[PDB]
Each structure stands twice: as structure tokens, then as C-alpha cells.
Design a protein around this ligand. Structure first.
Ligand SMILES: Cc1cc2nc3c(=O)[nH]c(=O)nc-3n(C[C@H](O)[C@H](O)[C@H](O)COP(=O)(O)O)c2cc1C
Ligand SMILES: Cc1cc2nc3c(=O)[nH]c(=O)nc-3n(C[C@H](O)[C@H](O)[C@H](O)COP(=O)(O)O)c2cc1C
Lengths: 200, 200
């Protein structure tokens, strides 16, 4: 089995979601030591913003590409081939200003291509990234789970389902900003959630 | 009064949300010819991505800022002063991959600052951008309104409410990708909605 781990926090070593993702990788290596694990850090190695030039590479028209466009198409091809090559997809999704981090958003914007990761049919869209199992590790300062201020969870569920990844489990670490006690309990509960996932 | 218009599409003159925003401005200048109108195009003049460095300017620590951090702080202060200086806020919010555009998101990430545009109190968050009225002009390829795939609408309501802009009117232009007839009808209906808003 091959595991891809996507890190998207801007807080580096202090990141709650990067710490839980590392715990995830540690546990998986112990319990399934034959599996290869690939870790991509979307903050350390940023994906460019999808602008008018880059959208012209992914939704091309009848003209030669610019060198920048060609480079963005190569990066997009590389990210998609990596996504399709792996079985278990662990996505670190910190909440910043009620959304996912731009670092993760830029990744998703290069991964979503018609005829590559999805296509529209007469019955609606069909996802082309098939047979995957995803785990979202999502950290928040406050408590939002199951309430009107959590658009991150349904958004991730919607975008992932769109490209074909409909088996998604969520690990939450909420209330981090209430203090070190609340954060430690949040981390211990998340680690126990990760344990059940790794041991299944 | 003073109207601020924020454009966020990556499609330039072909933008459906930009065309509707221009129509809004035209109608506003006819019905309210004394009002000041400011247009900021977040794609033509892009805001930087909130990364580790920039978050250190917005959420500072006990050390001198870098040149780049000082520059980003000055840009954030400019965008916030501009937001607070206008009474009516028009936001063109095209949907890309079930989210807002990164061009718009980068704007929000620089505008959301503790003690400046919001603060946390014992009774929860309180917005500091007060007395405003907003109009969201949001274009989509498909039909999403009032269904589970529209996370853009509640996200904008939530984010705008958080900084204090609770009075928000949504204008939709959906179904653009079904073809020229459907797009024509979308524009026609959205312009009618804009006419009611402006003439009220
Ligand atoms: C730029 C910024 C924006 C944030 N916005 C929110 C917010 O919208 N809601 C929330 O509950 N916490 C918010 N937080 C708190 C983070 O969600 C919390 O620190 C979480 O652990 C971040 O995950 P990370 O440590 O892996 O980066 C924000 C933090 C930062 C850095
Ligand atoms: C990068 C890209 C992603 C898109 N993703 C979606 C999608 O998630 N759902 C949808 O209904 N339309 C999607 N569309 C269609 C646009 O929402 C539609 O073209 C809309 O008119 C864009 O607004 P604009 O013309 O002002 O840029 C997408 C278009 C592009 C360029």
C-alpha cells in the first residue's frame, strides 16, 4: 500500500496538523513497515497561485503555451501522477479564516483537470481518481465541528468526492486556541482517532 | 456615499462577475451620481499569499520585522483603511473548484486581523468593520444555489459576518457553462436583481 501525506500549514514545526501527520506517518511505518510513504509539504515547496496565465495551461486554447505555462502543466501532471500512484491519501487541513490554507488550495487548483481527474457526463460529474482512501487531519483554534462556521469539512468532502475520492475519514483537533490543556486533549483525542485508523 | 468594488476573477474582460460588477457601477452612477466609486481588481493587482513570513507580520512576535514583512503590513493596513472608508462593498466572487478564487482569498487573509477588523471577547468574536452594506456578485458554471455543493455562499456570509459585515445581499449568476442562452438568461436575471438593489 502507498501513503501520500500532504502538509499545508504555514507554522512549520509548530503546526498542530504537521505534528499529527508526523504521528500518522510514525504509526503507519510501525504497523505497516512494508508500505512506502511519500510526504509532500505544500508550504516548504509551494504550488503557484492559479491566475489567468496558469489557467491557460490547464484549460488550453488554440495557441502555443508560454514557458511558464508549460512549467505549470508539468507540475500539474506531476502532482496528479503522484495522487493516482498512491492508495491512502492523508491531507493536513488547518483552518485559516474559515477556509483551508492557500497552500492546500493551490494544490487542489492544479489537480482538478477535466478529462484527467474529473469529467462531466449527461448524468453529472464523474470523478477519475478512483479506489483511494483519504484521511483528513484538520486543526482549528476554536470549536466548529458540526456547526454553521465549519465550511472546511463539507468543502473537503465535496471537492474530494468530485475528483472521485468518496471514502474520507476526518480527524479533528479543535479548540487548540483555548490553551495548552485544551490543545493537549485535542491532540490526544486525535492521536487515538489515528490509532483506530492505522490499526484497521 | 462611497462604493468599493472588488473584482476577483482570473478571466479579465471575459469574466461574467466583472461584467455584472461593471453593470452595477453603471447603475450606481445613474441612480447615485454624487457617490465616490473605487474599483480594486485583485487579479490585475494581486495580493500576496499568506505564508509563514507574512503571517509573522500580521501576528507579530518579539523581534524586528523583515523588509518584506514591513511591506506586507503596509499593504494590509492600506486594504483595511480602504474597506473601513467605504460604505457599500461590492464583491465579485466567482466559484472555482467549489471555493472562491485565490485572488479574493488572499485579500481576506490580509484583511482579517485581531484588534483591527475583529476581536475575541468572552461572548465570542465581534467584528470591527461596522455600518457597511455588502453585495456579493457570484458566478458559477453549474447550478448550486441552496444545495450542498454551494460552500461559497455560507463561507462569504461567515467570513464577512466575522469582521462585522453582516448586512450582505447575494446576487447569483448560475448555469453559465450550460451555453450562451443559459448564460444570457443568468446575466439578465442577475441584472434585474442588481436593478432592485440599486433602486431601493
Ligand atoms: C492565519 C490564521 C487564521 C486562523 N483562522 C482561524 C479560524 O478561522 N477559525 C479557527 O477556529 N482558528 C483559526 N486559526 C487557528 C488555527 O486554526 C490553529 O492555530 C490550528 O492549529 C492551525 O493548524 P496548524 O497549527 O497545523 O497550522 C487561525 C490561525 C492563523 C495562523
Ligand atoms: C478554474 C476554474 C474552476 C471552476 N470550477 C467550478 C466549479 O467548482 N463549479 C462551477 O459551477 N463552476 C466552476 N467553474 C465555472 C465558473 O464558475 C464560471 O465560469 C463563472 O462564470 C466564473 O466567473 P467569472 O467568469 O467571473 O470568472 C470554474 C471555472 C474555472 C476557470
Amino acid at each position: 500500500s502507498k501513503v501520500l501525506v500532504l502538509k499545508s500549514s504555514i507554522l512549520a514545526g509548530y503546526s498542530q496538523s504537521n505534528q499529527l501527520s508526523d504521528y500518522f506517518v510514525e504509526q503507519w511505518r510501525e504497523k505497516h513497515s512494508a508500505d512506502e510513504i511519500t510526504v509532500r509539504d505544500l508550504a516548504a515547496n509551494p504550488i503557484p497561485v492559479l491566475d489567468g496565465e496558469l489557467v491557460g495551461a490547464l484549460r488550453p486554447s488554440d495557441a502555443p503555451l508560454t514557458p511558464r505555462q508549460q512549467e505549470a502543466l508539468a507540475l500539474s501532471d506531476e502532482l496528479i501522477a503522484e495522487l493516482k500512484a498512491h492508495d491512502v491519501i492523508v491531507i493536513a487541513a488547518p483552518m485559516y479564516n474559515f477556509n483551508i490554507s492557500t497552500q492546500l488550495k493551490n494544490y487542489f487548483d492544479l489537480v482538478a483537470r477535466a478529462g484527467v481527474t474529473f469529467r462531466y457526463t449527461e448524468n453529472g460529474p464523474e470523478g477519475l481518481v478512483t479506489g483511494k482512501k483519504a484521511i483528513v487531519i484538520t486543526s482549528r483554534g476554536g470549536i466548529h465541528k458540526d456547526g454553521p462556521t465549519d465550511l472546511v469539512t463539507p468543502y473537503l468532502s465535496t471537492f474530494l468526492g468530485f475528483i472521485g475520492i468518496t471514502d474520507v475519514k476526518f480527524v479533528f483537533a479543535e479548540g487548540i486556541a483555548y490553551g495548552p490543556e485544551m490543545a493537549a486533549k485535542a491532540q490526544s483525542d486525535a492521536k487515538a482517532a489515528i490509532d483506530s485508523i492505522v490499526s484497521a
